[PDB]
Amino acid sequence: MDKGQIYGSIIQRNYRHPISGQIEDSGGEHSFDIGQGMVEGTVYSDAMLEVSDAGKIVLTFRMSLADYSGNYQFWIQPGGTGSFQAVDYNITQKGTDTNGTTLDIAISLPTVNSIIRGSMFVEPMGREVVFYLSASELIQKYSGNMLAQLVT
Ligand code: HEM
Ligand code: HEM
């Protein structure tokens, strides 16, 4: 583990891609209001951003409703443009809220200037969903219970 900084971050949660304006989820344009609420209800806004002095970055976000979903896959898109690049993730912690299991998902980023695309199957919906996340509004001092993967 390396010298660096641990920030609090606010996750921008998007049903509609913030750069292209396109919705990839099969719900499409006519479902924007329910889709946006669904992303917001699933992914917590408060997150952790680790930046080592050497330049490595790890973003941890928290997913609610994990008892109802699965087959998580993630892609990175630097600058929010160009191709989606498949990326590994690690569950660094599990917790609980009023909906059951929560998962802390850690993903390495080439830059904070990055879109994360996620997809997963949702059991009660009987279909897979596609959404976008990105980190902003950095807070110098992280406050919360996520577990640091990278920096001391
Ligand atoms: C975060 C990603 C998600 C997106 C983008 C999303 C999107 C949507 C959309 C567009 C609909 C309208 C029906 C349809 O198009 O199939 C819907 C319905 C529904 N979703 Fe999701 N959803 C997400 C996550 C979840 C999760 C994790 C659950 C598990 C509890 C869930 C439970 C439901 C239920 C029960 C309905 C039908 C009831 C209703 O009309 O609201 N969703 N969702
Ligand atoms: C019996 C019917 C419903 C059920 C079981 C249900 C369940 C849920 C669940 C489990 C969540 C995830 C966040 C949380 O646990 O607090 C959620 C979020 C949400 N629901 Fe419902 N819901 C229902 C009806 C509705 C209706 C009628 C509306 C519209 C007035 C609505 C609007 C929203 C919105 C906007 C969110 C996102 C809130 C957030 O940002 O955390 N829901 N719902």
If you measure from the C-alpha of residue 2 to the centroid of ligand 2, how many angstroms do you get, rounded to a whole number? 40
If you measure from the C-alpha of residue 61 to the centroid of ligand 2, how many angstroms do you get, rounded to a whole number? 20
Q: Say whether 141 sits in a helix, a strand or coil.
A: coil
| 5 in Cβ contact with 25 (< 8 Å) | no
| Exposure b/e, 104-143, CB count within 10 A at least 16 = b | bbbbbbeebebbbbbebebeeeeeebbbbbbbeeeeeebe
Pairwise CA distance, residues 71 & 108, whole Å: 19
The bound ligand whose nearest atom lies closest to the alpha carbon of 44 is 2
Placement of tokens 């191709």 in the chain: 83
| 25 in Cβ contact with 129 (< 8 Å) | yes
Q: Which two tokens stand for residue 139?
A: 């807070």
Distance between the two ends of the chain, CA-based, in angstroms?
Answer: 6
> For the chain, what are the domain ranges?
1-152
In ligand 1, the atom with minimum distance to the C-alpha of 25 is 5
**Options 3.40.50.2020, 1.10.10.60, 2.60.120.1440, 2.60.40.1850; CATH of 1-152:** 2.60.40.1850
CA distances from 74 to 5, 33, 35 (A): 24, 23, 18
If you measure from the C-alpha of residue 143 to the centroid of ligand 2, how many angstroms do you get, rounded to a whole number? 26
| 149 in Cβ contact with 90 (< 8 Å) | yes
The bound ligand whose nearest atom lies closest to the alpha carbon of 97 is 2
Q: Say whether 125 sits in a helix, a strand or coil.
A: helix
Q: Residue 127, annotated ligand binder?
A: yes
Please give the resolution of this entry in Å, rounded to 1 decimal: 2.1
Q: Which two tokens stand for residue 112?
A: 């904070």
Q: Residue 125, annotated ligand binder?
A: yes
| 73 in Cβ contact with 118 (< 8 Å) | yes
CA distances from 54 to 50, 58, 100, 112 (A): 11, 12, 37, 14
Q: Find the DSSP H helices in 19-114.
A: 32-42
In ligand 2, the atom with minimum distance to the C-alpha of 97 is 15
| 125 in Cβ contact with 70 (< 8 Å) | no
The bound ligand whose nearest atom lies closest to the alpha carbon of 121 is 1
If you ran DSSP here, which 8-state letter would residue 82 be given? S
If you measure from the C-alpha of residue 152 to the centroid of ligand 1, how many angstroms do you get, rounded to a whole number? 38
